[PDB]
Amino acid sequence: SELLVNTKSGKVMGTRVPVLSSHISAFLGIPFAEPPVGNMRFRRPEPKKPWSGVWNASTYPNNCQQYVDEQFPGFSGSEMWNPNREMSEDCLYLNIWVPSPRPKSTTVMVWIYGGGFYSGSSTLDVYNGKYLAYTEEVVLVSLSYRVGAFGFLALHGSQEAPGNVGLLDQRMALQWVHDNIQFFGGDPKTVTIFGESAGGASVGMHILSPGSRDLFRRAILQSGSPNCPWASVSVAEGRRRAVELGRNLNCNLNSDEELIHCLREKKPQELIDVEWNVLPFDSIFRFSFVPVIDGEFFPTSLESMLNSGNFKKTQILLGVNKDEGSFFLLYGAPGFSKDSESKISREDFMSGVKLSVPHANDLGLDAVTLQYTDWMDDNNGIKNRDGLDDIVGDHNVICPLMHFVNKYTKFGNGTYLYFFNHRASNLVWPEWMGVIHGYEIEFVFGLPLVKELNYTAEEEALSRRIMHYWATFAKTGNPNEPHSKWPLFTTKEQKFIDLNTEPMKVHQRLRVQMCVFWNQFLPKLLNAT
């Protein structure tokens, strides 16, 4: 049958799904590691152990233990991100979507999900790979990896909970794709890892990590960069936060040995219940458990790796959305709310700014205020709302990614840059938030093609237009077809394109203005004071 496949780990039998008018085959929930339950908790993952008999690949697997977002219960705008399958410490699986009939050796795309390192699932509807697979004849795989403390708790010296382990889960699935994707018709010479926010930062990170480089060809990064200030911590800090976790559960903090034995004793939900207390800062866009700069995963510091080409040289496509800040401010900042327009007082702006740049002293603080204030109208509520959206955007996504780009392209082998600024016509969040973080994904995964979710005509155009760009680049190293064109990004000129339902424009020097602020000036200033 098309649906029975022999793989180095065992025979797997999938299932066949409908898509638009045609069909496709789906393999759902293939395990690729020993379940990290028990007291494999926090440990590095181990390989699956071949099964006998025929693994059932026809339902979605579980989601990993994660914080579940209740802030707007019943609101789809927020629910669309929540685990939608049962949660379990047993959740290392992956999913494949293969064209019918099976290709022999075609392009592979591996999706890695975002979620701030504390959350996310392979199984959410917006990450359904059947449209992409179908429309572009590519093999589409989505992996899944451990989040929050289960995934990133890090007690350096120790082998019991070493750090970066979720990051290892990702690599382990990338191994299994490497070794078996050929039996599904995928060309392993030709995998593209691609992801959003934490997912983007992780792709970035496997460009850098030496044990990750050989496992893939090309990378696409959305709204995320391995150098984003919220994406890594020092080993000391990770140590500090793990022991802090131990405290709100009343563990013995005498050896590492005992901390871990303790944390391992606790039910998954009690770790989740207190995870947000270990933050060092009142802040937004910061997360508890996070890649740590351990020296084994990352041989050295991010910055100096970037500096001396110590990273995989291939070609990359990446980008930012127009309002990366809003979603964060809505959740975290005094003054913003889902149902009003959220005019912010000159009072609330100040505390907004404070929460966004939690490591700055106040001289640093003034420098920011100065930079983003309309001094001729320093009271307009709207201007403050927006100014704040740009601070959180720039400081957290746009400018660290621009820095990553500039260093990448000295030694890279081709670089393509987008600025997605389209607001979906049926977006269910309010207007003031604009083109929000995360909201290109549904265009990438091709949901505007499905009539009953209500998109414009042109939106569907934009979606396939994007999907092709993506699939072509994965297959080619170039988003463009042999004969108007998405230009390469160069250090000399720095062209990038708009992605949106009208005819594309090339521009230059994305937020260059403000990125020199965050990239050169502020850091020098905090270093002096």
Ligand X SMILES: CN1C=CC=C/C1=C/NO
Ligand Y SMILES: *[C@H]1O[C@H](CO)[C@@H](O)[C@H](O)[C@H]1NC(C)=O
What are 140's strand-pairing partners?
Answer: 97, 109
* Binding partner selected for residue 59 from ligand Y, ligand X, none, CB under the kind-specific 5 to 8 Å limit: ligand Y
Separation between Cα atoms, residue 506 and residue 511, nearest integer Å:
14
Catalytic residue among 122, 142, 197, 202: 197
Using CB under 6 A as the binding rule, the residues of this chain from 69 to 108 that contact ligand X are 81
Q: Is 301 in the site for ligand Y (CB under 6 A)?
A: no
Site map 401..440 versus ligand X, x via CB under 6 A: ------------------------------------xx--
Helices (H), 137-228: 148-152, 165-180, 198-208
Using DSSP bridges, classify how beta strands 415-420 and 316-321 pair: parallel, antiparallel or unpaired. Answer: parallel
Separation between Cα atoms, residue 217 and residue 192, nearest integer Å:
6
Using CB under 6 A as the binding rule, the residues of this chain from 310 to 349 that contact ligand X are 327
Separation between Cα atoms, residue 386 and residue 384, nearest integer Å:
5
- Is 78 among the catalytic positions? no
* The one among 35, 280, 334, 414 contacting ligand Y by CB under 6 A: 414
- Is 437 among the catalytic positions? yes
* Binding partner selected for residue 197 from ligand Y, ligand X, none, CB under the kind-specific 5 to 8 Å limit: ligand X
Using CB under 6 A as the binding rule, the residues of this chain from 179 to 238 that contact ligand X are 197
Catalytic residue among 89, 324, 440, 460: 324
Task: Name the segment binding ligand Y (CB under 6 A); options: 52-60, 71-79, 145-153, 390-398.
Answer: 52-60
CB 94 to ligand Y: min, Å: 15
Contact by Cβ (8 Å): 163, 238: yes
* Binding partner selected for residue 134 from ligand X, ligand Y, none, CB under the kind-specific 5 to 8 Å limit: none
* CB nearer to ligand Y: pick between 451 and 492: 492
* The one among 115, 200, 229, 393 contacting ligand X by CB under 6 A: 115
* Binding partner selected for residue 286 from ligand Y, ligand X, none, CB under the kind-specific 5 to 8 Å limit: none
Separation between Cα atoms, residue 381 and residue 387, nearest integer Å:
10
Place of tokens 């889960």: 169
* Binding partner selected for residue 58 from ligand Y, ligand X, none, CB under the kind-specific 5 to 8 Å limit: ligand Y
Q: Is 268 in the site for ligand X (CB under 6 A)?
A: no
Q: Is 56 in the site for ligand Y (CB under 6 A)?
A: yes
* CB nearer to ligand X: pick between 1 and 71: 71
Encoded tokens for 153:
């708790």
CB 414 to ligand Y: min, Å: 4
Alpha-carbon separation of residue 219 from 88, 200, 445 (angstroms): 30, 9, 16
Contact by Cβ (8 Å): 210, 305: no
Interrupted after residues, the chain (C–N over 2.5 Å) = 483
Q: Is 413 in the site for ligand Y (CB under 6 A)?
A: yes
* Binding partner selected for residue 438 from ligand X, ligand Y, none, CB under the kind-specific 5 to 8 Å limit: ligand X
Contact by Cβ (8 Å): 148, 275: yes
Separation between Cα atoms, residue 63 and residue 86, nearest integer Å:
6
Alpha-carbon separation of residue 340 from 364, 402, 422 (angstroms): 31, 33, 22
Contact by Cβ (8 Å): 106, 99: yes
- Active site positions, annotated: 197, 324, 437
Q: Rule CB under 6 A: which residues touch ligand X?
A: 81, 113-115, 120, 197, 327, 437-438
